[PDB]
Amino acid sequence: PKTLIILAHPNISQSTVHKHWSDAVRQHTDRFTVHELYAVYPQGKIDVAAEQKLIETHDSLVWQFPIYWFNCPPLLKQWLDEVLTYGWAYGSKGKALKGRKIALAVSLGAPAADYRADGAVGCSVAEVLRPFELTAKYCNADYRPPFTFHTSEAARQEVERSARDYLAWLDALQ
């Protein structure tokens, strides 16, 4: 099957990076499925059954989102809590993610130079994303290296380049 992209962005219209990323991926619907949580669940009423079946019908799983306060948007956190249930994602009968490739595709609003021991943040991007790595590993998934991008003509071209790199990263994952 194809790769399922769980895209969580509270306002993708005002988005530049994720909007470009989303557009690029929707050009190959036979290879990827862009699932926009905020668009599908504008009231936050996640359909667990629907979400789980979507994952089962796909192969690799990707969580795409902007890094807000060194974390994910709220709807993604809710998605994790309500979709990865005991008996499905983990626990005795829960093997839905066992051996499944899981990776993150994220954007950061600070320079990469900041996420270093000698940088303003003092921590690496990997240390920041640890919660999601632990989540995937807990469910016995095959956690893969994340796709990252740190955020106007030249700038616009760079974002376009990132979108192309994202596609390549996606294919590699497959």
Where on the chain is the footprint of a copy of itself (CB under 8 A)?
Answer: 10, 44, 68-75, 77-78, 80-81, 84, 121-123, 127-128, 130-131, 134-135, 138
Is residue 28 annotated as involved in ligand binding?
no
Is residue 40 annotated as involved in ligand binding?
no
Rg over CA atoms, the chain: 16
Nearer to a copy of itself, 44 or 145 (CB): 44
Residue pair 102/61 in contact by the 8 Å Cβ criterion: yes
Q: Does 9 bind ligand FMN (CB under 6 A)?
A: yes
| Separation in Å, CA 144 to CA 43, 96, 131, 152 | 31, 17, 14, 32
Residue pair 139/89 in contact by the 8 Å Cβ criterion: yes
Q: Which stretch binds ligand FMN (CB under 6 A): 50-58, 62-70, 140-148, 160-168?
A: 62-70
Is residue 79 annotated as involved in ligand binding?
no
E-only strand ranges, 8-162: 32-36, 61-66, 101-108, 142-143, 147-150
CB of 15 to ligand FMN, least distance (A): 3
Restricting to residues 63-92, name those near ligand FMN by CB under 6 A.
66-70, 81
The Cα 133–Cα 140 span in angstroms is: 11
Q: Which residues are annotated as a binding site for FMN?
A: 9, 15-18, 67, 69-70, 107, 109, 115
